[PDB]
Write a structure and sequence with these properties.
Chain A has 50 residues and is an all-alpha fold. Chain A is built from three helices and no strands.
Chain lengths: 50, 45
């Protein structure tokens, strides 16, 4: 814990990216969060809304 | 313009699918204008 600030910078960078990567897989009210799923079983207009 | 069966009138829109749209007349998915339809048993043939 001596290197408090620097280890917190590295923590924050990893934390930011894992946050940002988790968010790829959030729904946001779309039926899936993994894009090909939405394309897999919808008409193109309904798909483009989702 | 064309004639189709009265139940078939449903099919004609952008983004919609079915063998009329598939094999007879594709609309672009970003069409502009109007679709107009009515019966024609005088053309019933």
């Amino acid at each position: 814990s001596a290197l408090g600030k620097l280890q917190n910078v590295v923590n924050q960078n990893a934390q930011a990216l894992n946050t940002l990567v988790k968010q790829l897989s959030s729904n946001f009210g779309a039926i899936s969060s993994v894009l090909n799923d939405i394309l897999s079983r919808l008409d193109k207009v309904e798909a483009e809304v989702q | 313009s064309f004639v189709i069966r009265g139940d078939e009138v449903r099919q004609i829109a952008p983004g919609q699918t079915g063998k009329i749209a598939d094999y007879n007349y594709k609309l672009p998915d970003d069409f502009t204008g109007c679709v107009i339809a009515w019966n024609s048993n005088n053309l019933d043939n």
